[PDB]
Amino acid sequence: HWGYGKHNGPEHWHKDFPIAKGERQSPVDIDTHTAKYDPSLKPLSVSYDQATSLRILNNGHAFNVEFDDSQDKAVLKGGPLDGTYRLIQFHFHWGSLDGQGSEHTVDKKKYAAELHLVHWNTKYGDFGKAVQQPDGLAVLGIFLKVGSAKPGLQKVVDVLDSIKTKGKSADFTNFDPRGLLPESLDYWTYPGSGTTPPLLECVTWIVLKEPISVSSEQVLKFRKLNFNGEGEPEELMVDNWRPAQPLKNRQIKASFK
Numbered sequence: 001h002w003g004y005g006k007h008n009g010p011e012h013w014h015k016d017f018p019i020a021k022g023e024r025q026s027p028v029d030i031d032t033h034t035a036k037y038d039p040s041l042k043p044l045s046v047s048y049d050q051a052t053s054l055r056i057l058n059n060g061h062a063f064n065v066e067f068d069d070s071q072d073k074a075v076l077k078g079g080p081l082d083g084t085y086r087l088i089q090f091h092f093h094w095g096s097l098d099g100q101g102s103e104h105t106v107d108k109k110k111y112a113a114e115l116h117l118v119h120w121n122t123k124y125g126d127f128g129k130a131v132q133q134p135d136g137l138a139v140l141g142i143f144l145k146v147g148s149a150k151p152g153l154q155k156v157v158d159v160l161d162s163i164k165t166k167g168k169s170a171d172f173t174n175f176d177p178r179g180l181l182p183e184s185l186d187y188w189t190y191p192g193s194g195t196t197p198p199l200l201e202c203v204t205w206i207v208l209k210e211p212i213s214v215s216s217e218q219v220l221k222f223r224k225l226n227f228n229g230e231g232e233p234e235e236l237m238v239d240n241w242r243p244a245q246p247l248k249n250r251q252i253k254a255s256f257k
């Protein structure tokens with residue numbers, strides 16, 4: 001099955017998931033000089049005051065912080081979006097080294113990691129239906145650079161010992177995702193896809209310009225997680241990122257000059 005290794009990594013995924021070579025795949029390089037400022041783009045509305053986190057899961061490819069999405073509690077709207085998108089989970093992609101790990105790049109620059117806050121369009125009722133629609137998901141992408149610690153990340157880092165291996169979960173209530181956001185909500189936006197199989201082309205990407213800083217110790221702890229199950233040979237969960245894919249017939253828009 002798919003993964004991030006030599007024999008089952010991103011260069012292989014097209015054999016089981018032919019959409020890997022499609023017309024609106026993600027991630028992409030964000031060429032900041034080529035992105036066009038769109039003064040009609042609205043400010044992003046991030047409404048996380050009532051977010052209800054539930055659980056954290058190691059799925060064998062990343063860890064997901066899951067939310068109660070059975071009511072409009074943590075929603076994204078505005079920006080390039082029409083309508084209301086509910087937060088279902090967040091996750092990260094990260095490197096073996098601080099010089100790599102992000103999926104999106106900025107003028108070819110790679111960040112140490114990238115946080116994806118996954119939201120689904122409430123006009124489609126559930127996440128599973130939404131992923132079959134070209135406007136089904138909105139993913140807020142935030143870059144991580146190594147420097148000062150992010151205090152609001154530390155509760156995540158502290159639980160990772162309890163979900164070291166594939167299939168482990170832990171209760172993870174009362175986590176406030178507002179503590180992972182940078183100051184500015186200036187963004188880039190384009191149409192694309194999930195970055196893991198099944199690579200469905202259902203995502204409006206919203207990539208914040210301003211990274212967050214995390215400490216070297218925080219991202220070190222991400223790198224101690226395992227892709228394997230308990231009792232299987234240890235394979236560190238590192239370099240779980242897809243490289244940039246061809247832009248094809250797409251324009252990246254900027255909310256800012």
Ligand SMILES: Oc1cccccc1=S
Pocket residue numbers: 091116118139193194195196
């Ligand atoms: O990595 C992902 C995993 C699962 C669902 C939706 C979006 C992304 S980027």
Ligand SMILES: [Zn+2]
Pocket residue numbers: 091092093116195196
């Ligand atoms: Zn992702």
